[PDB]
């Protein structure tokens, strides 16, 4: 039964593990999109200045 539980907990830990790197992947892609929105903002600010 300990073999059973340890294998299942291994699935659980691997799951949380991959999920952490995936949420970090979203955290990266979202800062990437946070920079292009800033690019659009900069242009909007320039238009307002004009």
């Amino acid at each position: 039964t300990l073999h059973r539980e340890m294998e299942k907990v291994k699935l659980d830990q691997k799951r949380l593990d991959q999920e952490l790197d995936f949420i970090l992947s979203q955290q990266k892609e979202l800062e990437d999109l946070l920079t292009p929105l800033e690019e659009s903002v900069k242009e909007q600010s320039g238009t307002i200045y004009l």
Binding site: L20, D21, Q27, E31, T35, Y49
Partner: protein, 183 residues
């Protein structure tokens, strides 16, 4: 400021170096100025109420306490922050090489200025968060702690602190980075 941060620093990795030490030296330059810039920044409630100045007939917002912008860049996922961390990881690896002179002295001083700016952000962050929370820019800042446990792009996990430690292994050769790190 924008000229230095967007054009020089953030690109410093993409520039070709005929003398490799030049990348390190240029990063060192940009870092020196950003450092001194933050080092004088005193957080005040004036910075967060956008002072309106009539410049050239248009009402433009006056610049906040000089470091505020830099702080907003360090208190969020700015390519500046990730670049700090990337230079950090790269310096850690290069140190791990235990290799001679190439670009070294500049590399040391660079990473040292980086650690200094980190310490400074941590130092001022308490009052800065108090003031921002008192004047309420919708700007969301995270205390540098949570960011430091960030999941490193190269590492794919939170080894920023672990890497930061690893320099402590290089103590007997580099006392300086060890001091900064332990701080």
């Amino acid at each position: 400021l924008q000229f230095l941060r967007d054009t020089v620093f953030l690109r410093y990795r993409t520039r070709a170096y005929r003398r490799a030490a030049e990348k390190w030296e240029v990063a060192e330059a940009v870092l020196d100025v950003f450092y001194k810039l933050l080092k004088d920044y005193e957080p005040q409630p004036e910075d967060f109420v956008d002072q309106y100045v009539e410049l050239q007939g248009e009402e433009r917002v006056a610049f906040k306490p000089p470091g505020f912008s830099l702080m907003h860049h360090l208190l969020n996922e700015s390519p500046m922050l990730e670049l700090c961390l990337s230079l950090m990881e790269e310096g850690v690896t290069q140190l791990d090489t235990y290799a001679p002179f190439p670009g070294k002295k500049h590399l040391e001083k660079a990473v040292a200025y980086c650690f200094m700016l980190l310490n400074l952000t941590l130092q001022k962050e308490n009052r800065f968060m108090d003031l921002l929370r008192e004047s309420h820019l919708s700007m969301i800042v995270t205390p540098l702690e949570q960011l430091l446990q960030g999941i490193n792009p190269r590492s794919k996990k939170a080894d920023n602190v672990v890497n930061i430690a690893r320099y402590l292994c290089h103590g007997n050769s580099n006392a300086e980075l060890a001091f900064e790190s332990a701080k």
